[PDB]
């Protein structure tokens, strides 16, 4: 029943982002001394459905001179990549057990910028194209440091297999072994998804929104698996699933908290942040985490 497995992996993610919209709106409402939506539905529970119905029946403003090809393609690529990133995730058993799971996710993330580039280029506006170029530059800039931090952390694991991350953290979380890399990784995940304080930018807009929120949840789930390792009992994986979901929810709520707490950067300020604070520390800590298992004779097994 592989089709059933695919559908039961994909539909719940879309429902989760649908209600993530509500959870974010209500959490920021209560952090702003007010309440979020609590009218449409018993506790706002019907708000995402109302928003979806309103958006799906509204006139689609095709630019009437743009390239229809790229205009259609960009949301397709966005959703396809956002849903594909969830394939190799081991909670605890992955849908598609791969040897180079981390590498596959890195490659998909690298593809993710084509949607931004095509949406900007097919918008038929100079200002929108400038904004798209700025966003693409920020994204590639921060994916450099994501890649380096990721390989440095995986040096403690022995491979690119995502399931082994459960075994690596059977006694202690990876947060304690390397918290500085975790801090820079968290900030880089914030800057990748164009989230505050790095947010400097009817139907297709809804698909773009769904892709972005799916990416947010996916990044937080990957962070939880990578740095906050839940203990997995082979004879009852429900405990691991519960722990993983709880940690993912905590990290997503932390993104909402950060968006509610801080002002935003300038473009040159976040470029300077990356290239002159995160890259040097990332390189130094990469050297440190290369040398540490050799110094301490604690190299992980798999080769």
Partner 1 sequence: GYSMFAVGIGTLLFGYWSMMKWNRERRRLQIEDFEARIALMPLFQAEKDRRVLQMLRENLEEEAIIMKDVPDWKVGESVFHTTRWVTPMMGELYGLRTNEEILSATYGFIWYT
Partner 2 sequence: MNIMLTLLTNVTLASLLVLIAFWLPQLNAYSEKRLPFSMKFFLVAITFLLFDLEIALLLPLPWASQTNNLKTMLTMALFLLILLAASLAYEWTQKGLEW
Partner 3 sequence: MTMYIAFILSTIFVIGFVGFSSKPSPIYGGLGLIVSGGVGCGIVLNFGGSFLGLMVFLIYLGGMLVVFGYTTAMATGDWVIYDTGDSGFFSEEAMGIAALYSYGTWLVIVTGWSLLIGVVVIMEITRGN
Ligand X SMILES: CCCCCCCC/C=C\CCCCCCCC(=O)O[C@H](COC(=O)CCCCCCC/C=C/CCCCCCCC)COP(=O)(O)OCCN
Q: Which residues contact 207 (CB under 8 A, 6 or more apart)?
A: 75, 78, 79
225, 161 contact by CB (below 8 A) = no
For partner 1, which residue of 170, 231, 284, 290 counts as binding (CB under 8 A)?
A: 170
Task: List, in sequence order, the alpha helices (H) in the chain.
Answer: 2-31, 47-56, 68-84, 101-111, 113-121, 126-154, 164-168, 174-177, 179-192, 203-227, 238-261, 267-273, 279-296
Nearer Cβ to partner 3 (9/136)? 136
Nearer Cβ to ligand X (100/113)? 100
63, 206 contact by CB (below 8 A) = no
- In the complex, minimum distance from the CB of residue 298 to partner 1, in angstroms, rounded to a whole number: 4
134 binds partner 2 (CB under 8 A): yes
147 binds partner 2 (CB under 8 A): yes
121 binds, among partner 3, partner 1, partner 2, none (CB under 5 to 8 A by kind): partner 3
182 binds ligand X (CB under 6 A): yes
156 binds partner 1 (CB under 8 A): yes
Nearer Cβ to partner 2 (73/253)? 73
Measured distance CA(139)–CA(184) in Å, rounded:
15
Q: What is the DSSP letter of 86?
A: T
CB environment 79-109: b (16+ within 10 A), e (fewer): bebbbbbbbbbbbbebbbebeebbbbbbebb
For partner 1, which residue of 23, 28, 40, 96 counts as binding (CB under 8 A)?
A: 96
Q: On the CB side of 242, how many CA atoms lie within 13 Å of its CA?
A: 5
- In the complex, minimum distance from the CB of residue 279 to partner 2, in angstroms, rounded to a whole number: 6
Measured distance CA(220)–CA(229) in Å, rounded:
13
- In the complex, minimum distance from the CB of residue 229 to ligand X, in angstroms, rounded to a whole number: 12
Nearer Cβ to partner 1 (100/136)? 100
- In the complex, minimum distance from the CB of residue 171 to partner 1, in angstroms, rounded to a whole number: 5
Count of chain residues binding ligand X (CB under 6 A): 24
Q: Cα 253 to the chain's mean position, in Å? A: 13
Nearer Cβ to ligand X (46/98)? 98
273 binds ligand X (CB under 6 A): yes
132 binds, among partner 2, partner 3, ligand X, none (CB under 5 to 8 A by kind): partner 3
Give the interface with partner 1 as residue ranges (CB under 8 A).
96-98, 156, 167-168, 170-172, 176-179, 292-293, 296-302
């Amino acid at each position: 029943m592989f089709m059933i497995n695919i559908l039961s992996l994909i539909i719940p993610i879309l429902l989760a982002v649908a209600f993530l919209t509500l959870v974010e709106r209500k959490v920021l409402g209560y952090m702003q001394l007010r309440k979020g939506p609590n009218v449409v539905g018993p506790y706002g529970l019907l708000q995402p459905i109302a928003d979806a119905l309103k958006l799906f029946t509204k006139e689609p403003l095709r630019p009437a001179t743009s390239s229809i090809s790229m205009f259609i393609i960009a949301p397709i690529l966005a959703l396809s990549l956002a849903l594909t990133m969830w394939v190799p995730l081991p909670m605890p058993y992955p849908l598609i057990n791969m040897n180079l799971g981390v590498l596959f996710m890195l490659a998909m993330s690298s593809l993710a910028v084509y949607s931004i580039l095509w949406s900007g280029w097919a918008s038929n506006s100079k200002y929108a194209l400038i904004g798209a170029l700025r966003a693409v530059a920020q994204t590639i800039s921060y994916e450099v440091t994501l890649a380096i931090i990721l390989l440095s952390v995986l040096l403690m694991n022995g491979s690119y297999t995502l399931s082994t991350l459960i075994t690596t953290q059977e006694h202690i979380w990876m947060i304690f072994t390397s918290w500085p890399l975790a801090m820079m990784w968290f900030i880089s995940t914030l800057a990748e998804t164009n989230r505050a304080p790095f947010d400097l930018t009817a139907g297709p807009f809804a698909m773009f929104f769904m892709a972005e929120y799916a990416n947010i949840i996916m990044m937080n789930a990957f962070t939880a698996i990578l740095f906050l390792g839940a203990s997995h009992d082979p004879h009852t994986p429900e405990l691991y699933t519960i722990n993983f979901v709880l940690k993912t929810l905590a990290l997503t709520i932390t993104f909402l908290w950060i968006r509610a707490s801080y002002p935003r950067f300038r473009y040159d300020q976040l470029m300077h942040l990356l290239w002159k604070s995160f890259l040097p520390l990332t390189l130094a800590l990469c050297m440190w985490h290369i040398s540490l298992p050799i110094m301490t004779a604690s190299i992980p097994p798999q080769s």
